[PDB]
Amino acid sequence: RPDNTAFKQQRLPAWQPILTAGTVLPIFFIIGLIFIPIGIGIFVTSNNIREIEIDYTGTEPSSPCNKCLSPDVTPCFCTINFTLEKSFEGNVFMYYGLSNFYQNHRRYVKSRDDSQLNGDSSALLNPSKECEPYRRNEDKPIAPCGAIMNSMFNDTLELFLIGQDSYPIPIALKKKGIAWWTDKNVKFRNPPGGDNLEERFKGTTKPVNWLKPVYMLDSDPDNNGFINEDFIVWMRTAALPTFRKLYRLIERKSDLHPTLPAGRYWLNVTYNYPVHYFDGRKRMILSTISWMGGKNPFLGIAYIAVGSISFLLGVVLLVINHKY
Amino acid sequence: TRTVFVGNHPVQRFCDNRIVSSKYTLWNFLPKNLFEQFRRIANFYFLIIFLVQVTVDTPTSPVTSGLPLFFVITVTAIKQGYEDWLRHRADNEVNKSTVYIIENAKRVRKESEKIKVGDVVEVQADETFPCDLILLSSCTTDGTCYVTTASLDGESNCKTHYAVRDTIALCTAESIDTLRAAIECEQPQPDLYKFVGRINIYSNSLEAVARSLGPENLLLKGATLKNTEKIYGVAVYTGMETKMALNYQGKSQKRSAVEKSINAFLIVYLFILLTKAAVCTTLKYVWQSTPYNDEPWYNQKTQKERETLKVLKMFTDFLSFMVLFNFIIPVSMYVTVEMQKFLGSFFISWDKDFYDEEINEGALVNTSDLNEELGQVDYVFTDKTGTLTKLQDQAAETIEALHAAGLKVWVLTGDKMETAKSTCYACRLFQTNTELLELTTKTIEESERKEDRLHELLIEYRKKLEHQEYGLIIDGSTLSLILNSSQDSSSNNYKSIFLQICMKCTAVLCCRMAPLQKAQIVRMVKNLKGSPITLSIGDGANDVSMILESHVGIGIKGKEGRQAARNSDYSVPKFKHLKKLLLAHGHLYYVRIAHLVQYFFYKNLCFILPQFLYQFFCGFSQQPLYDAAYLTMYNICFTSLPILAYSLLEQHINIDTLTSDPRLYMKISGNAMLQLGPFLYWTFLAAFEGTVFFFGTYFLFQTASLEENGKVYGNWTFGTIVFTVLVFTVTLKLALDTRFWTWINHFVIWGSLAFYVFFSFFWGGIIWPFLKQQRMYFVFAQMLSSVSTWLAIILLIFISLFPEILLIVLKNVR
Numbered sequence A: 001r002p003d004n005t006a007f008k009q010q011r012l013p014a015w016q017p018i019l020t021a022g023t024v025l026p027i028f029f030i031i032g033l034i035f036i037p038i039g040i041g042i043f044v045t046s047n048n049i050r051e052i053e054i055d056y057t058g059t060e061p062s063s064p065c066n067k068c069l070s071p072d073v074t075p076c077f078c079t080i081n082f083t084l085e086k087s088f089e090g091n092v093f094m095y096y097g098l099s100n101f102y103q104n105h106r107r108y109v110k111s112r113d114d115s116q117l118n119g120d121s122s123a124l125l126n127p128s129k130e131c132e133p134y135r136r137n138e139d140k141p142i143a144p145c146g147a148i149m150n151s152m153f154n155d156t157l158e159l160f161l162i163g164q165d166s167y168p169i170p171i172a173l174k175k176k177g178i179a180w181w182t183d184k185n186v187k188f189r190n191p192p193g194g195d196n197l198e199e200r201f202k203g204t205t206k207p208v209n210w211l212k213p214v215y216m217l218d219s220d221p222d223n224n225g226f227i228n229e230d231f232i233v234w235m236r237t238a239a240l241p242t243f244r245k246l247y248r249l250i251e252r253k254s255d256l257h258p259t260l261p262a263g264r265y266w267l268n269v270t271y272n273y274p275v276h277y278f279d280g281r282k283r284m285i286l287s288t289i290s291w292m293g294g295k296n297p298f299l300g301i302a303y304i305a306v307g308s309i310s311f312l313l314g315v316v317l318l319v320i321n322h323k324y
Numbered sequence B: 001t002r003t004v005f006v007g008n009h010p011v012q013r014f015c016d017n018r019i020v021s022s023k024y025t026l027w028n029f030l031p032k033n034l035f036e037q038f039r040r041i042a043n044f045y046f047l048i049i050f051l052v053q054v055t056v057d058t059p060t061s062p063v064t065s066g067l068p069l070f071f072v073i074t075v076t077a078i079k080q081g082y083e084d085w086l087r088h089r090a091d092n093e094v095n096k097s098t099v100y101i102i103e104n105a106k107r108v109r110k111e112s113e114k115i116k117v118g119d120v121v122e123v124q125a126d127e128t129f130p131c132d133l134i135l136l137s138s139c140t141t142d143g144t145c146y147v148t149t150a151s152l153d154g155e156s157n158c159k160t161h162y163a164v165r166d167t168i169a170l171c172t173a174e175s176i177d178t179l180r181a182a183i184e185c186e187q188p189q190p191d192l193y194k195f196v197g198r199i200n201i202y203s204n205s206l207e208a209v210a211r212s213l214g215p216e217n218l219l220l221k222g223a224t225l226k227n228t229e230k231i232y233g234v235a236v237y238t239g240m241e242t243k244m245a246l247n248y249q250g251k252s253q254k255r256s257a258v259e260k261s262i263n264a265f266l267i268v269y270l271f272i273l274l275t276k277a278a279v280c281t282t283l284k285y286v287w288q289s290t291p292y293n294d295e296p297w298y299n300q301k302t303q304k305e306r307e308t309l310k311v312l313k314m315f316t317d318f319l320s321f322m323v324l325f326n327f328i329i330p331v332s333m334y335v336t337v338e339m340q341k342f343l344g345s346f347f348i349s350w351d352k353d354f355y356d357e358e359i360n361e362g363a364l365v366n367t368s369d370l371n372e373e374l375g376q377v378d379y380v381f382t383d384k385t386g387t388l389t390k391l392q393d394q395a396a397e398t399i400e401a402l403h404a405a406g407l408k409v410w411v412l413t414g415d416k417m418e419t420a421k422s423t424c425y426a427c428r429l430f431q432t433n434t435e436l437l438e439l440t441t442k443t444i445e446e447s448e449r450k451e452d453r454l455h456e457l458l459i460e461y462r463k464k465l466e467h468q469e470y471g472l473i474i475d476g477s478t479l480s481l482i483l484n485s486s487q488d489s490s491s492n493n494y495k496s497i498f499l500q501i502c503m504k505c506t507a508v509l510c511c512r513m514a515p516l517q518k519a520q521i522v523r524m525v526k527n528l529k530g531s532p533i534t535l536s537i538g539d540g541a542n543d544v545s546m547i548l549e550s551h552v553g554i555g556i557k558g559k560e561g562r563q564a565a566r567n568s569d570y571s572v573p574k575f576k577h578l579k580k581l582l583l584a585h586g587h588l589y590y591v592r593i594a595h596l597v598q599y600f601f602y603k604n605l606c607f608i609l610p611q612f613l614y615q616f617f618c619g620f621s622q623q624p625l626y627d628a629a630y631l632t633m634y635n636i637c638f639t640s641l642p643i644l645a646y647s648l649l650e651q652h653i654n655i656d657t658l659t660s661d662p663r664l665y666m667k668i669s670g671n672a673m674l675q676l677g678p679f680l681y682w683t684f685l686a687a688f689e690g691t692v693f694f695f696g697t698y699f700l701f702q703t704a705s706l707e708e709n710g711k712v713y714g715n716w717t718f719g720t721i722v723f724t725v726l727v728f729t730v731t732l733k734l735a736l737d738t739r740f741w742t743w744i745n746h747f748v749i750w751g752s753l754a755f756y757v758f759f760s761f762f763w764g765g766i767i768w769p770f771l772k773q774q775r776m777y778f779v780f781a782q783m784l785s786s787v788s789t790w791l792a793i794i795l796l797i798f799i800s801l802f803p804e805i806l807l808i809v810l811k812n813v814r
């Protein structure tokens, strides 16, 4: 009828591409030609990265850090010697890892009060109900309620370089600057108002497992409470049972000398965090980075195994379809 | 034996004159519609998952299952109740008609639905009768009128009925008032040719004149009155009791062959979901069997959760995985299968190749629930007088397209045997050199002589012969010996032998076929060795029983009457319009909904597989991999339009090259796209991809840093790298299956990838005050701030579309 338009009559102008077999052979080659030079470019990068991870959870009779797997008098102490055979060039990043630690657990991931850690005047006093077990003690509301904040990692890892003399020179670790800029300046804010942080937390208590309240975490007014880097970094669950969390960073020296000269080092740790109750390991990880991140050979050997299986499948499918 | 009074006055137990071509009344709509809604295994599963969530206390709320369910059930009930309200209006323009009546010495004009048994109706030339009248007098003398029941029994000639000699001289509507008679009739029967009654007109003093009635006096309903000024009937049967309405068999529930596959796919995904939820609970309690694998001192249980009985947490843990993986069984595919069924049935109404100038109207759509099974028919049981007939415009070049496409055309008529055989000879259904196997009453004048020839022409004459060599011919008398008398003799069942000659002959022709014998032929063929999709295209009131009995029954908007254009599913105003309705409209309608159900299970098995593999790296604690705003928005926002705009305006073979070429119809015949071969490719390509999304991100997260500043990611950046690879892979798997790239397929395929990337950059980036979580603040703007997360997303989108691409290079050559 007078409704014989291009749409109602099913004759809209279309593209109709005929994806034949004769115009797809130049695909398997243009792919395999830009994936091998990538898989090879991001596979030598992942190899020039220097990295060393020393495990110190004890569990060994001949382990220096075994004398306090279950110590009688705290705090413990333990020194571990590692050896850097090839000096670290750029700025290095000190980490710490934990295995068998399920930070990605339904009953654990959900155990925070995201409105309380955001400076909400009303949440600070009456925390949520998802952080239930660690939500009140002594009839007072725990300041950082929840399990994610109650189990903060609190080992003290220090590094020393055994110089030409027997005396060791301690390398300076930079604490601030290890948490996402957004979730420290925006997402993690202190309570609403006050002069000194010791007041803003009036009717609140310190978590059960902590030693010092959240307003005494650090002596830096911009690193003191709810914005503590070590705290902001722990409160970001790990997504897997074996994770790494940035601990410190060692800025590169203004001169050309290396950031970690090759030699014998001391890793003296204050063993506070018990990770053996649940068969969990505990290690330290120094490393340098690159535009790609850390040392991971998956992207390197995955762009070549996919950019070189095409260059072949593009040939076979060009010799079999070449008979005709 | 009912007693009817002539003037409805003395010298009430009768039905009311009304037409009901609809399914639901106003009272039995819900009790009757809901039952039709729960024939879907997804509406039943989600009513049980909602009933358990309302009697037990579970960590999930009854709104996760009740909200979707109570939306799919009220969307397919506004369409099924609206499409059936239009069938209440078609019967309103016929019931609320005008028919005059001699009420009391005055020509009252009631409606065609307010006629009561025993009132003297009057009809004018070319006016069909409203009810089963009983001719009392005709304008002219001789008390005879000419009626043509071309729509009641296929006979096109003019029949001649007689008046009642006692009242031939009654007219003017003033003498009809002086008529005292009592009509004793027989209770309404469907015979259509027998009748027994009596008239006992009572004179003033004494008169026992009893002129017995017969089938020569009864004027049936639906038979036009030709070549006569007017008549004066006395209604006896009044609708739903008329002999025309006693040959209707009774509406049933018609469901296409794709609505039966959505239930075979929903039964293998009900075992893929009870094996996920059961493999995760069998393992969640061998894992927890260690004392430090539950309550590991860094997350401890509440006093409440510690006392719960262990035999009740094994159940609420199972029921908590089903609710975690319940996206595998989509109930958002029913809100799209009906939005596409309703908006796609418009291309049949809007078509201008269905417009008839000399009747001034085009195709109809009585039900949209069968759009997809027009392109799946195997037998077409046509009618002769009126639909195929002198042949019509192209009623012979259309039977050549129904035979090139692989269909089998049976001509079920109600006219003579050879006279019909001619107009099927004429239509080129029985070519000159086609050995006719005549099982008529002209060769079978006995009860046993049929057997002597039934197998004499199958066991030795038909199989030992091809296509055009042989063709059958039957009757209504003989076909009653093969059906009725053959329900006892089972040593060599007649119906078995006979039903072998029919599937071996090119075309069959059945003559003298009563209105309820064309429904037994459509029923015999619906059962034999499979489920041959049968079509039935008639135009009269005897083709309404074979139109309610077929899988998809077409009706012809002819001149005689619209009794078949009301009880049908579609209606074209010609027979030749069936070549474009099956070849071009059923081939597209099917390929569009057969790909919307293949892609709706693929879509959601790639979604929940990377979330079932996580439970092995979580504590089997049913922790969602993705955010909560990403789980709900996936099926409704991020992936809902690209497939809708495909199932509505996508032609994989141009609509001008499948109307001409009729052999592409057998490419899709037999449910080609929803078979077990194409099903195992969409299910294995969704378990191969869902495994590459997760284990391609699980291997990328072994770096200790994914960016140049040495910062680590959480579990919400792990879940949006598996969700970003997932949305680009299921959206570019449809952009590869698309052959018709309209400007609406360019706007929903690239406008749904530019919305997930804009919604994410917007949902995360503000500290939403109304939320209690604020857990996705910058998980997306930082995920995209690393070069190793770009090179990893564009490598998992290619490793996942390698199968779909390699198949395009192999399947697309020879």
Ligand SMILES: CCCCCCCCCCCCCCCCCC(=O)OC[C@H](COP(=O)(O)OC[C@H](N)C(=O)O)OC(=O)CCCCCCCCCCCCCCCCC
Pocket: B063, B064, B065, B067, B068, B071, B326, B327, B329, B330, B331, B332, B335, B336, B628, B629, B631, B632, B633, B634, B635, B636, B637, B638, B640, B641, B747, B748, B751, B752, B755
């Ligand atoms: C805004 C932020 C929201 C954040 C929410 C965070 C909190 C969520 C809490 C979760 C608890 C439950 C909350 C309520 C849940 C509502 C569910 C709902 O409304 O279903 C409506 C239905 C079904 O949905 P589903 O996702 O397929 O889920 C089915 C599954 N079986 C289930 O268990 O539940 O879905 C349908 O009915 C399908 C409709 C298909 C038709 C297409 C409609 C298009 C919509 C608009 C699209 C815009 C696209 C933009 C394109 C740009 C231009 C190209």
Ligand SMILES: *[C@@H]1O[C@H](CO)[C@@H](O)[C@H](O)[C@H]1NC(C)=O
Pocket: A077, A078, A079, A160, A168, A266, A267, A268, A269
């Ligand atoms: C580092 O550890 C050693 C272990 O002997 C201990 O003396 C002290 O904690 C640190 N040593 C120096 C020199 O700072």
Ligand SMILES: OC[C@H]1OC[C@@H](O)[C@@H](O)[C@@H]1O
Pocket: none
């Ligand atoms: O040993 C278990 C410890 O639990 C908590 C701690 O504060 C003490 O009350 C107690 O010693």
Ligand SMILES: [Mg+2]
Pocket: B150, B151, B154, B383, B384, B385, B386, B387, B539, B540
């Ligand atoms: Mg007819």
